[PDB]
């Protein structure tokens, strides 16, 4: 059948699709990302993300682990700067107790102090594993230098805050952001009725709208961290459109025009106006792409470069110059059509998997409360037109930039030189 | 418990064997001729 939606009077969104899949998935989406913290409770969302298997009021930890592993189901937590999503999946004959476990975890945690004291070492280990690659550190640095208050908060807990996050901070964060008006329960392979009926046992406790988050403010700035990696990972971004604004799409078409990354393995070359503009001048190994991250109040669009330290300068300059050409109208309609085809194929392959489909429905729910059929999107992306793309470009080419650099930065330029 | 019982089964033959080995060894070393007088060749 099709997707089916009810908005409950306490604000909770219920979305269901019964496709008679052998494995069914059920996720719950909360507007409780890392942007809702301030300087007093930094890293609380990271410990909340890692605290999904802790003794809940309804279920002891042993059960919340042995019962999910007994049926072979999976419980995972995915977190962005805006949204958290707790997802369970398993055989249709066990999703009743899977919803019991998931809704107990979402609605009634206990946050015992010895459990979080044991979890803080896992928090440190998870942060080290996450920052084992340079991209993660350079994107966290880029957000920290790009924004002032809201979206500048890191996804991972700072080093000083380990050992300082308490049970009361987790309880305050849950009581202020895990309310029914900020939650959508989305189920693929289940009946809508049960979701409605599992939305009453729980998700009825907190009916508020939660403690809304401050508006994110852009700051600009360039940060460089000599780390030794032969490769100077450099991200240069500027402020862009919010998710909803039409301009948004234009920026997605602009990143797929300026390269969206590789499309071929071990042979991903000349796949980008950027890649072409770098490769016509530099014979060193490189990786240049376009970065776009848009959140419900603000967006970042820019370029991302990995290169040998020595060439790091002009490669960045070459990439920047290519965007300036797009800001001068130097583009062809066939290139924009190919960018639109790449963007729509990427969207369809993102929603072709079950967990990606459940995430998409989830995001749409929290964002606009409505489901937008894949088809609808296709015609809206088509709405974006050439001039629109050019426009977004000039926004980037003019707006104050924010630069995060890492590596041997002896030949990496600055923003006033860039 | 139910599970523990299953474990027992798997070890029952094993225990029997070891017990059997014990029995055999005991008789052999002890030189007990009562039981041994009941074996075809060694008897004597």
């Amino acid at each position: 059948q099709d997707l089916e939606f009810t908005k409950l009077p306490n604000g909770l969104v219920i979305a269901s699709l019964e496709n008679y899949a052998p494995l069914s998935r059920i996720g719950l989406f909360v507007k409780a990302g890392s942007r809702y913290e301030d300087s007093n409770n930094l890293g609380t969302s990271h410990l909340l993300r890692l605290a999904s298997s802790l003794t809940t009021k309804g279920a002891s930890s042993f059960k919340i682990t042995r019962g999910i592993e007994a049926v072979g189901g999976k419980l995972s937590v995915t977190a962005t700067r805006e949204n958290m999503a707790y997802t369970v999946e398993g055989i249709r004959s066990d999703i009743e107790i899977l919803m019991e476990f998931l809704l107990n975890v979402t609605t009634a945690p206990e946050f015992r102090r010895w459990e979080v004291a044991a979890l803080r070492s896992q928090l440190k280990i998870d942060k080290a594993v996450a920052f084992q690659n340079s991209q993660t550190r350079i994107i966290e640095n880029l957000h920290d230098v790009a924004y002032k208050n809201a979206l500048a908060n890191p996804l991972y807990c700072p080093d000083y805050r380990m050992g300082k996050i308490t049970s009361e901070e987790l309880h305050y964060f849950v009581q202020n952001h895990f309310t029914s008006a900020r939650m959508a329960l989305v189920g693929l392979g289940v009946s809508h009725s049960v979701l409605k009926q599992v939305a009453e046992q729980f998700l009825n406790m907190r009916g508020g709208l939660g403690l809304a988050g401050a508006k994110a403010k852009y700051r600009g700035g360039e940060i460089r961290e000599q780390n030794g990696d032969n490769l100077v990972h450099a991200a240069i971004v500027a402020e862009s459109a919010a998710i909803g604004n039409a301009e948004a799409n234009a920026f997605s078409v602009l990143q797929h025009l300026l390269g969206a990354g590789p499309h071929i393995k071990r042979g991903n070359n000349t796949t980008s106006l950027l890649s072409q503009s770098v490769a016509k001048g530099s014979h060193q190994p490189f990786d240049v792409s376009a970065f776009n991250a848009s959140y419900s109040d603000s967006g970042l669009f820019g370029i991302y470069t990995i290169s040998q330290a020595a060439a790091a300068g002009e490669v960045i300059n070459a990439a920047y110059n290519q965007v300036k050409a797009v800001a001068q109208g130097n583009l062809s309609s066939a290139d924009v059509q190919a960018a639109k085809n790449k963007l729509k194929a990427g969207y369809l392959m993102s929603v072709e998997t079950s967990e990606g489909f459940l995430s998409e429905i989830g995001s749409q729910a929290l964002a606009a409360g409505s489901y937008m059929p894949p088809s609808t999107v296709l015609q809206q992306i088509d709405s974006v037109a050439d001039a629109d793309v050019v426009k977004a470009a000039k926004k980037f080419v003019s707006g104050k930039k924010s630069m995060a650099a890492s590596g041997n930065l002896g030949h990496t330029p600055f923003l006033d030189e860039l | 418990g139910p599970r523990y019982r299953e474990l027992a089964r798997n070890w029952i033959p094993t225990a029997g064997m070891w017990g059997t080995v014990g029995a055999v060894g005991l008789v052999w070393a002890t030189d007990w001729r009562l039981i041994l007088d009941w074996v075809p060749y060694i008897n004597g």
Partner: protein
């Protein structure tokens, strides 16, 4: 830095004495692209970042 800094001097002058609270004893883990990071952690599924 005698007349220029004064009180701020000791901040710009290492002074290892060479010859002639104290420091309190001041990790190895198991083992590109562009897109907003999205951290993931699972009950049993190992964590991951799909940037």
């Amino acid at each position: 830095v005698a007349a220029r800094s004064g009180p701020f001097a000791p901040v710009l002058s290492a002074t290892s004495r060479g010859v002639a609270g104290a420091v309190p004893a001041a990790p190895v883990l198991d083992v590109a692209a562009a897109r907003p990071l999205v951290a993931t952690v699972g009950l049993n599924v190992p964590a991951s970042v799909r940037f």
